[PDB]
């Protein structure tokens, strides 16, 4: 029940029925026959491409290609501001993620070196960071968390962090974060 996705639903509901039809087809190289044929409503592009992650509830640059193509600049500009500047709780997954991340942040092993690799923080950074601060905790925990929430901010889903937590091997908080995930995903993916 997400404010950005509401807005996505709201641009779809501001569009005519041919245009929805056309949009389905015209995405030839992006939605192909099988994916094409099965979807029901006008929303069901929007529904799917969120689902498969062609966009997120942060920025939808790809979706804004589609909006642009179908002329309506009016629809664009409201959506544009949302993505440009008003990304405060726009993806609402971040908060329970941040909650969980705060919890993980408190109990820390020297394993942010493995973990930053595993999550795919860039190796040229890792190599340097490793060399720079070998034995220490402090600048590692600050680097690793900052670079992760820089890198995977637009793909901050709880599964990343669930997997990440377990890598650091704090098991008590693991099951806690898992129920954070389980209840949160279910309710929020639903609509």
PDB file of C-alpha atoms in Angstrom:
ATOM      1  CA  UNK A   1       0.000   0.000   0.000  1.00  0.00           C
ATOM      2  CA  UNK A   2       2.817   2.160  -1.037  1.00  0.00           C
ATOM      3  CA  UNK A   3       2.736   5.858  -1.836  1.00  0.00           C
ATOM      4  CA  UNK A   4       4.829   5.563  -4.965  1.00  0.00           C
ATOM      5  CA  UNK A   5       2.990   2.494  -6.161  1.00  0.00           C
ATOM      6  CA  UNK A   6      -0.267   4.316  -5.509  1.00  0.00           C
ATOM      7  CA  UNK A   7       1.163   6.945  -7.834  1.00  0.00           C
ATOM      8  CA  UNK A   8       1.986   4.308 -10.420  1.00  0.00           C
ATOM      9  CA  UNK A   9      -1.547   2.980 -10.118  1.00  0.00           C
ATOM     10  CA  UNK A  10      -2.656   6.575 -10.492  1.00  0.00           C
ATOM     11  CA  UNK A  11      -0.863   7.157 -13.785  1.00  0.00           C
ATOM     12  CA  UNK A  12      -2.303   3.916 -15.125  1.00  0.00           C
ATOM     13  CA  UNK A  13      -5.772   5.009 -14.102  1.00  0.00           C
ATOM     14  CA  UNK A  14      -5.190   8.279 -15.972  1.00  0.00           C
ATOM     15  CA  UNK A  15      -4.664   6.540 -19.267  1.00  0.00           C
ATOM     16  CA  UNK A  16      -7.053   5.391 -21.965  1.00  0.00           C
ATOM     17  CA  UNK A  17      -7.800   1.877 -22.984  1.00  0.00           C
ATOM     18  CA  UNK A  18      -6.205   1.782 -26.425  1.00  0.00           C
ATOM     19  CA  UNK A  19      -3.028   3.252 -24.983  1.00  0.00           C
ATOM     20  CA  UNK A  20      -2.919   0.492 -22.380  1.00  0.00           C
ATOM     21  CA  UNK A  21      -3.465  -2.049 -25.147  1.00  0.00           C
ATOM     22  CA  UNK A  22      -0.794  -0.483 -27.327  1.00  0.00           C
ATOM     23  CA  UNK A  23       1.698  -0.270 -24.469  1.00  0.00           C
ATOM     24  CA  UNK A  24       1.384  -3.995 -23.859  1.00  0.00           C
ATOM     25  CA  UNK A  25       2.240  -4.793 -27.451  1.00  0.00           C
ATOM     26  CA  UNK A  26       4.690  -2.004 -28.249  1.00  0.00           C
ATOM     27  CA  UNK A  27       7.040  -3.262 -25.561  1.00  0.00           C
ATOM     28  CA  UNK A  28       7.952  -6.057 -28.028  1.00  0.00           C
ATOM     29  CA  UNK A  29      11.486  -6.539 -26.856  1.00  0.00           C
ATOM     30  CA  UNK A  30      10.701  -6.014 -23.233  1.00  0.00           C
ATOM     31  CA  UNK A  31       7.474  -7.983 -22.767  1.00  0.00           C
ATOM     32  CA  UNK A  32       7.469 -10.940 -25.133  1.00  0.00           C
ATOM     33  CA  UNK A  33       4.649 -13.261 -26.132  1.00  0.00           C
ATOM     34  CA  UNK A  34       4.252 -15.345 -22.993  1.00  0.00           C
ATOM     35  CA  UNK A  35       4.508 -12.455 -20.567  1.00  0.00           C
ATOM     36  CA  UNK A  36       2.410 -10.473 -23.010  1.00  0.00           C
ATOM     37  CA  UNK A  37      -0.492 -12.827 -23.485  1.00  0.00           C
ATOM     38  CA  UNK A  38      -1.213 -13.602 -19.845  1.00  0.00           C
ATOM     39  CA  UNK A  39      -1.686 -10.159 -18.331  1.00  0.00           C
ATOM     40  CA  UNK A  40      -5.154  -8.923 -17.630  1.00  0.00           C
ATOM     41  CA  UNK A  41      -5.563  -5.249 -16.887  1.00  0.00           C
ATOM     42  CA  UNK A  42      -3.888  -1.971 -17.677  1.00  0.00           C
ATOM     43  CA  UNK A  43      -2.261  -2.212 -14.278  1.00  0.00           C
ATOM     44  CA  UNK A  44      -0.753  -5.548 -15.134  1.00  0.00           C
ATOM     45  CA  UNK A  45       2.217  -4.096 -16.927  1.00  0.00           C
ATOM     46  CA  UNK A  46       2.939  -1.945 -13.900  1.00  0.00           C
ATOM     47  CA  UNK A  47       2.164  -4.939 -11.679  1.00  0.00           C
ATOM     48  CA  UNK A  48       4.606  -7.198 -13.440  1.00  0.00           C
ATOM     49  CA  UNK A  49       7.509  -4.899 -14.055  1.00  0.00           C
ATOM     50  CA  UNK A  50       7.659  -4.039 -10.438  1.00  0.00           C
ATOM     51  CA  UNK A  51       7.496  -7.710  -9.632  1.00  0.00           C
ATOM     52  CA  UNK A  52      10.324  -8.803 -11.887  1.00  0.00           C
ATOM     53  CA  UNK A  53      12.195  -5.617 -11.021  1.00  0.00           C
ATOM     54  CA  UNK A  54      12.437  -3.479 -14.075  1.00  0.00           C
ATOM     55  CA  UNK A  55      11.742  -0.660 -11.591  1.00  0.00           C
ATOM     56  CA  UNK A  56      11.502  -0.073  -7.882  1.00  0.00           C
ATOM     57  CA  UNK A  57       9.326   2.237  -5.769  1.00  0.00           C
ATOM     58  CA  UNK A  58      12.149   4.768  -5.771  1.00  0.00           C
ATOM     59  CA  UNK A  59      12.999   5.658  -9.328  1.00  0.00           C
ATOM     60  CA  UNK A  60      11.186   4.307 -12.354  1.00  0.00           C
ATOM     61  CA  UNK A  61      13.245   5.664 -15.211  1.00  0.00           C
ATOM     62  CA  UNK A  62      12.243   2.799 -17.487  1.00  0.00           C
ATOM     63  CA  UNK A  63       8.575   3.301 -16.721  1.00  0.00           C
ATOM     64  CA  UNK A  64       9.027   6.989 -17.420  1.00  0.00           C
ATOM     65  CA  UNK A  65      10.141   6.017 -20.911  1.00  0.00           C
ATOM     66  CA  UNK A  66       6.702   4.504 -21.350  1.00  0.00           C
ATOM     67  CA  UNK A  67       4.961   7.512 -19.860  1.00  0.00           C
ATOM     68  CA  UNK A  68       6.990   9.812 -22.089  1.00  0.00           C
ATOM     69  CA  UNK A  69       6.165   7.819 -25.188  1.00  0.00           C
ATOM     70  CA  UNK A  70       2.452   8.156 -24.521  1.00  0.00           C
ATOM     71  CA  UNK A  71       2.684  11.918 -24.525  1.00  0.00           C
ATOM     72  CA  UNK A  72       1.156  12.977 -21.260  1.00  0.00           C
ATOM     73  CA  UNK A  73       3.637  15.330 -19.647  1.00  0.00           C
ATOM     74  CA  UNK A  74       1.143  16.017 -16.864  1.00  0.00           C
ATOM     75  CA  UNK A  75       1.417  12.435 -15.708  1.00  0.00           C
ATOM     76  CA  UNK A  76       5.167  12.715 -16.053  1.00  0.00           C
ATOM     77  CA  UNK A  77       5.793  15.768 -13.890  1.00  0.00           C
ATOM     78  CA  UNK A  78       3.961  14.571 -10.835  1.00  0.00           C
ATOM     79  CA  UNK A  79       5.770  11.251 -11.101  1.00  0.00           C
ATOM     80  CA  UNK A  80       9.045  13.048 -11.811  1.00  0.00           C
ATOM     81  CA  UNK A  81       9.033  15.033  -8.589  1.00  0.00           C
ATOM     82  CA  UNK A  82       8.354  11.921  -6.568  1.00  0.00           C
ATOM     83  CA  UNK A  83      11.404  10.202  -7.989  1.00  0.00           C
ATOM     84  CA  UNK A  84      13.526  13.337  -8.196  1.00  0.00           C
ATOM     85  CA  UNK A  85      13.185  14.713  -4.734  1.00  0.00           C
ATOM     86  CA  UNK A  86      10.366  13.297  -2.694  1.00  0.00           C
ATOM     87  CA  UNK A  87      11.819   9.854  -2.095  1.00  0.00           C
ATOM     88  CA  UNK A  88      10.984  10.004   1.630  1.00  0.00           C
ATOM     89  CA  UNK A  89       9.385   6.691   2.392  1.00  0.00           C
ATOM     90  CA  UNK A  90       8.637   6.174  -1.263  1.00  0.00           C
ATOM     91  CA  UNK A  91       9.902   2.713  -1.178  1.00  0.00           C
ATOM     92  CA  UNK A  92       8.526   1.761   2.167  1.00  0.00           C
ATOM     93  CA  UNK A  93      10.683  -1.352   2.528  1.00  0.00           C
ATOM     94  CA  UNK A  94      13.639   0.708   3.721  1.00  0.00           C
ATOM     95  CA  UNK A  95      12.262   1.269   7.209  1.00  0.00           C
ATOM     96  CA  UNK A  96      12.029  -2.290   8.409  1.00  0.00           C
ATOM     97  CA  UNK A  97      15.304  -2.789   6.592  1.00  0.00           C
ATOM     98  CA  UNK A  98      16.876   0.103   8.500  1.00  0.00           C
ATOM     99  CA  UNK A  99      15.345  -1.242  11.687  1.00  0.00           C
ATOM    100  CA  UNK A 100      16.908  -4.616  11.037  1.00  0.00           C
ATOM    101  CA  UNK A 101      20.168  -3.005   9.919  1.00  0.00           C
ATOM    102  CA  UNK A 102      20.374  -1.021  13.180  1.00  0.00           C
ATOM    103  CA  UNK A 103      19.988  -4.263  15.052  1.00  0.00           C
ATOM    104  CA  UNK A 104      22.680  -5.990  13.010  1.00  0.00           C
ATOM    105  CA  UNK A 105      24.928  -2.959  13.324  1.00  0.00           C
ATOM    106  CA  UNK A 106      24.983  -3.407  17.067  1.00  0.00           C
ATOM    107  CA  UNK A 107      26.548  -6.860  17.115  1.00  0.00           C
ATOM    108  CA  UNK A 108      29.436  -7.066  14.759  1.00  0.00           C
ATOM    109  CA  UNK A 109      32.119  -9.535  13.836  1.00  0.00           C
ATOM    110  CA  UNK A 110      35.223  -8.944  11.778  1.00  0.00           C
ATOM    111  CA  UNK A 111      33.258 -10.388   8.928  1.00  0.00           C
ATOM    112  CA  UNK A 112      32.265  -7.189   7.191  1.00  0.00           C
ATOM    113  CA  UNK A 113      35.212  -7.911   4.947  1.00  0.00           C
ATOM    114  CA  UNK A 114      33.637 -11.109   3.718  1.00  0.00           C
ATOM    115  CA  UNK A 115      30.169  -9.646   3.790  1.00  0.00           C
ATOM    116  CA  UNK A 116      30.958  -6.591   1.691  1.00  0.00           C
ATOM    117  CA  UNK A 117      32.397  -8.868  -0.958  1.00  0.00           C
ATOM    118  CA  UNK A 118      29.463 -11.247  -0.731  1.00  0.00           C
ATOM    119  CA  UNK A 119      26.894  -8.474  -1.161  1.00  0.00           C
ATOM    120  CA  UNK A 120      29.021  -7.146  -4.021  1.00  0.00           C
ATOM    121  CA  UNK A 121      30.575  -3.959  -2.780  1.00  0.00           C
ATOM    122  CA  UNK A 122      33.143  -3.260  -5.465  1.00  0.00           C
ATOM    123  CA  UNK A 123      36.414  -5.129  -5.182  1.00  0.00           C
ATOM    124  CA  UNK A 124      38.718  -2.172  -5.849  1.00  0.00           C
ATOM    125  CA  UNK A 125      37.256  -0.722  -2.764  1.00  0.00           C
ATOM    126  CA  UNK A 126      37.484  -3.971  -0.802  1.00  0.00           C
ATOM    127  CA  UNK A 127      41.106  -4.572  -1.803  1.00  0.00           C
ATOM    128  CA  UNK A 128      42.055  -1.092  -0.690  1.00  0.00           C
ATOM    129  CA  UNK A 129      39.848  -1.090   2.386  1.00  0.00           C
ATOM    130  CA  UNK A 130      41.258  -4.411   3.515  1.00  0.00           C
ATOM    131  CA  UNK A 131      44.815  -3.210   3.093  1.00  0.00           C
ATOM    132  CA  UNK A 132      44.089   0.161   4.643  1.00  0.00           C
ATOM    133  CA  UNK A 133      42.467  -0.979   7.838  1.00  0.00           C
ATOM    134  CA  UNK A 134      43.394  -4.597   8.422  1.00  0.00           C
ATOM    135  CA  UNK A 135      42.813  -5.405  12.086  1.00  0.00           C
ATOM    136  CA  UNK A 136      40.347  -2.731  13.087  1.00  0.00           C
ATOM    137  CA  UNK A 137      36.611  -2.792  13.598  1.00  0.00           C
ATOM    138  CA  UNK A 138      35.571   0.842  13.588  1.00  0.00           C
ATOM    139  CA  UNK A 139      36.310   2.119  10.093  1.00  0.00           C
ATOM    140  CA  UNK A 140      35.326  -1.249   8.690  1.00  0.00           C
ATOM    141  CA  UNK A 141      31.823  -1.133  10.163  1.00  0.00           C
ATOM    142  CA  UNK A 142      31.449   2.454   9.065  1.00  0.00           C
ATOM    143  CA  UNK A 143      32.807   1.862   5.547  1.00  0.00           C
ATOM    144  CA  UNK A 144      30.945  -1.387   4.938  1.00  0.00           C
ATOM    145  CA  UNK A 145      27.558  -0.126   6.067  1.00  0.00           C
ATOM    146  CA  UNK A 146      27.934   3.186   4.279  1.00  0.00           C
ATOM    147  CA  UNK A 147      29.058   1.619   1.023  1.00  0.00           C
ATOM    148  CA  UNK A 148      26.280  -0.950   1.150  1.00  0.00           C
ATOM    149  CA  UNK A 149      23.556   1.607   1.753  1.00  0.00           C
ATOM    150  CA  UNK A 150      25.107   3.691  -0.992  1.00  0.00           C
ATOM    151  CA  UNK A 151      25.312   0.804  -3.423  1.00  0.00           C
ATOM    152  CA  UNK A 152      22.177  -1.190  -2.686  1.00  0.00           C
ATOM    153  CA  UNK A 153      19.918   1.669  -1.677  1.00  0.00           C
ATOM    154  CA  UNK A 154      17.744   1.369  -4.732  1.00  0.00           C
ATOM    155  CA  UNK A 155      17.706  -2.363  -4.241  1.00  0.00           C
ATOM    156  CA  UNK A 156      17.382  -2.513  -0.484  1.00  0.00           C
ATOM    157  CA  UNK A 157      15.101  -5.465   0.077  1.00  0.00           C
ATOM    158  CA  UNK A 158      15.079  -7.462   3.287  1.00  0.00           C
ATOM    159  CA  UNK A 159      16.355 -10.628   1.611  1.00  0.00           C
ATOM    160  CA  UNK A 160      19.668  -8.939   0.984  1.00  0.00           C
ATOM    161  CA  UNK A 161      20.014  -8.170   4.654  1.00  0.00           C
ATOM    162  CA  UNK A 162      18.628 -11.483   5.877  1.00  0.00           C
ATOM    163  CA  UNK A 163      21.298 -13.269   3.899  1.00  0.00           C
ATOM    164  CA  UNK A 164      23.852 -10.708   4.991  1.00  0.00           C
ATOM    165  CA  UNK A 165      23.060 -11.084   8.674  1.00  0.00           C
ATOM    166  CA  UNK A 166      23.526 -14.831   8.561  1.00  0.00           C
ATOM    167  CA  UNK A 167      26.921 -14.304   6.985  1.00  0.00           C
ATOM    168  CA  UNK A 168      27.984 -12.293  10.004  1.00  0.00           C
ATOM    169  CA  UNK A 169      26.666 -15.183  12.038  1.00  0.00           C
ATOM    170  CA  UNK A 170      24.498 -13.600  14.686  1.00  0.00           C
ATOM    171  CA  UNK A 171      21.855 -16.289  15.006  1.00  0.00           C
ATOM    172  CA  UNK A 172      19.511 -14.886  17.639  1.00  0.00           C
ATOM    173  CA  UNK A 173      18.829 -11.781  15.682  1.00  0.00           C
ATOM    174  CA  UNK A 174      18.683 -13.882  12.536  1.00  0.00           C
ATOM    175  CA  UNK A 175      15.372 -15.482  13.372  1.00  0.00           C
ATOM    176  CA  UNK A 176      14.136 -12.113  14.505  1.00  0.00           C
ATOM    177  CA  UNK A 177      15.009 -10.456  11.198  1.00  0.00           C
ATOM    178  CA  UNK A 178      13.467 -13.398   9.399  1.00  0.00           C
ATOM    179  CA  UNK A 179      10.085 -12.715  10.980  1.00  0.00           C
ATOM    180  CA  UNK A 180      10.567  -9.073  10.138  1.00  0.00           C
ATOM    181  CA  UNK A 181      10.965 -10.267   6.569  1.00  0.00           C
ATOM    182  CA  UNK A 182       8.202 -12.856   6.596  1.00  0.00           C
ATOM    183  CA  UNK A 183       5.450 -10.630   7.894  1.00  0.00           C
ATOM    184  CA  UNK A 184       6.620  -7.576   5.984  1.00  0.00           C
ATOM    185  CA  UNK A 185       7.022  -9.174   2.556  1.00  0.00           C
ATOM    186  CA  UNK A 186       3.699 -10.950   2.701  1.00  0.00           C
ATOM    187  CA  UNK A 187       1.561  -7.975   3.553  1.00  0.00           C
ATOM    188  CA  UNK A 188       3.383  -5.468   1.392  1.00  0.00           C
ATOM    189  CA  UNK A 189       3.794  -7.528  -1.771  1.00  0.00           C
ATOM    190  CA  UNK A 190       0.072  -8.260  -1.649  1.00  0.00           C
ATOM    191  CA  UNK A 191      -0.899  -4.738  -2.609  1.00  0.00           C
TER     192      UNK A 191
END
